[PDB]
Amino acid sequence: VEQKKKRTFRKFTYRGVDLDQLLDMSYEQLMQLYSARQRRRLSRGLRRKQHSLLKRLRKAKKEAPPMEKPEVVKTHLRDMIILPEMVGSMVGVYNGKTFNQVEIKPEMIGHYLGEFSITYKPVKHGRPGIGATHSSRFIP
Amino acid sequence: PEKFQHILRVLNTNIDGRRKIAFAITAIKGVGRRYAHVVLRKADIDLTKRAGELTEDEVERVITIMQNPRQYKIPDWFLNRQKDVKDGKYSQVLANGLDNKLREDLERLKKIRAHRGLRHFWGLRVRGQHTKTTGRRGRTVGVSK
Amino acid sequence: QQLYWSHPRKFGQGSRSCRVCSNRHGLIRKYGLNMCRQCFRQYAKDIGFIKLD
RNA sequence: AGCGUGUGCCUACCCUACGCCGGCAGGCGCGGGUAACCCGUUGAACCCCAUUCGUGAUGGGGAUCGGGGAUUGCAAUUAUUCCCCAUGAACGAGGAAUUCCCAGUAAGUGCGGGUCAUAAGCUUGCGUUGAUUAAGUCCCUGCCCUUUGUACACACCGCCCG
RNA sequence: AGCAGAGUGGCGCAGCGGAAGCGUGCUGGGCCCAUAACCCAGAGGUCGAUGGAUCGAAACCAUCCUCUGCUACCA
Q1: Dihedral sign for Cα atoms in the order A43, A49, A51, A56
Q2: Is A35 within 8 Å of A22 (Cβ atoms)?
Q3: What nucleotides of chain D have any atom within 7 angstroms of a protein Cβ?
Q4: Which GO terms describe its molecular function (chain A)?
Q5: Quick one: B85 and B141 in the same domain?
Q6: Number of structural domains, chain B?
Q7: Is residue B26 within 8 Å of B40, Cβ to Cβ?
């Protein structure tokens, strides 16, 4: 985090309230801020051993030197709502083999982890091949 | 009868007096036909005549009833935008401000650099759609020697 | 040993099984089937049906 | 209007009337149905009757795309599905070619079943509206029978010459 | 320098007073069990400059420049 004017100040407070209020809110007040799909995941779910992640983040954030980010906490979980408390941590997210590391911004809140790590090569081409049409055939 | 005036200019788009009132107004972006048949009735005027038959006094009221819809008791769900996101309110966006707002949300999703902004910048479909047989601009491919 | 061996199967194509051997792929439910379409044919003679049309 | 279908089944699940709340998706309270018994006297679409639009890429077309609301699930991101507002593209009757069809038939139009925790532009059946053209021929494509010719029998997609 | 041609819109040749003309090629489609032959479909765009008539100009007509073809000299 090194941004400005994306969740406080002139230009942008997160739906009319700063980050500072969010951290003191419970999930209950927080979810009522419009983002419909989020509200399912909280009201139904209520912690199905996401315990393992959220303690490591706070822990590592605490022990890390001031003006320096922690190491990483890794996940195979690509699903979990990005939240204000999570911000400032650094998380590696499993793809099919690779843990792509990302810094968490206060501007990413509401989204999932898995949107910030891709799981395919964008694509290049190409040079059409042989049978790539109604012409390829014959040899002997 | 009624030779008084025809084509005119209003905010950001030129609106003809040739067409009926509701349908004339739709040309302005952020206003569909569904949005206009409401706003005319809140203004309590005919929609059964042409747009060139409105007076200046009348059309002055139209834009006020349009741009403060909550204060003239058009419901929140009936707006374009409910809690924009990071602005904190219900809003109604019209022609040249719509584009400015739109370009921000594109920029935002490449700022965070989600899956969205990458698909935008690459010029590929955002939503769940196959691109294998969808598109073409391109198709000239050869392989012989 | 282990503390897991399973994960929720409660709906979908994996929580029902067809009676060949516990075969699948060949999604089947009809009128209380649970009976595989390949073998259904072999039980055209057997009772449940005789072909008439 | 018709063929059907429906919880008590697989392991956790059906079809819904009625009352109440919401613009809508939907929520909530009660009741029936093992079914010619309850949903359902299946109060469906095209069609029919009256307004509005006017030859204009138009209010035809609804692709693309932004924001928001619901439902299923252990989980919905590369948007499961559904709803609301906004955005408004190609396309103005289609080359060379080619498919299918003879009477409740073609075509138009809706519905049930199948897969199904959530979900048909598919497939399988069913009703509804309902023409034009033919009553023939071997021209093309192909098939049956006889006669004839053959260097073919891996059978003309054959064999074979410089 | 005398005469002639041209100054691409894929190629090569450059067709005429209506914005690619001809020939060819490449790429794709069609026909066929398949190939050849045969039949169709393409492609961002004052076509060196300065002007006039013109609805318009590689193309209707001029004034200039350059490159080449044939002829051929000033240097």
Answers
A1: negative
A2: no
A3: 6, 9-12, 23, 53-54, 59, 64-81, 84-88, 114-117
A4: MDM2/MDM4 family protein binding; RNA binding; structural constituent of ribosome; ubiquitin ligase inhibitor activity
A5: yes
A6: 2
A7: no
> Is B5 found in the same domain as B44?
yes
B143 in contact with nucleic chain E (CB within 7 A): yes
Judge whether B33 and B39 are in contact, CB under 8 Å.
no
- Residues in chain A closer than 8 A to B108 (CB atoms): 107
Q: Which residues contact A77 (CB under 8 A, 6 or more apart)?
A: A50, A53, A113
* Residue with the two structure tokens 């997160």: A14
User: Looking at the structure, do residues B56 and B84 belong to the same domain, yes or no?
Assistant: no
Does A140 map to a domain? no
| Rounded CA separation B18/B98 (Å) | 26
Quick one: B113 and B132 in the same domain? yes
Rounded to the nearest angstrom, the minimum Cα separation between A3 and chain B is 11
Q: Where in the sequence is the domain holding C11, given as residue range(s)? A: 1-53
Report resolution (Å) to 1 decimal.
3.0
Residues 98-137 of chain A whose Cβ lies under 8 A from any Cβ of chain B: 105, 107-108, 111, 115-116, 118, 122, 127-130, 132-133, 135-136
Residue finishing a domain among B43, B75, B107: B75
Q: Annotated binding residue at C17? A: no
The total of other beta-carbon atoms located within 10 Å of residue A27's CB is 14
Nearest CA in chain A to B140: A128
Whole-angstrom CA distances from A24 to A20, A41, A59, A81, B29 are 7, 20, 19, 18, 41
Nearest to A15 among B86, B111, B144 (CB): B86
DSSP-derived secondary structure for A41-84: HHHTTS-SS-HHHHHHHHHHHHHSPTTS----EEES----B--T
Q: Could you give the C-alpha distances from A57 to A10, A63, A74, A94, B77, in angstroms and in order?
A: 30, 10, 10, 17, 38
Q: Which of A106, A122, A101 is nearest to B115 (CA)?
A: A122
CA B32 to chain centre: 7
For chain B, say whether A79 makes contact (Cβ under 8 Å): no
The parent domain of residue A91 ranges over 9-127
> Which residue range is the domain that position B142 belongs to?
76-145
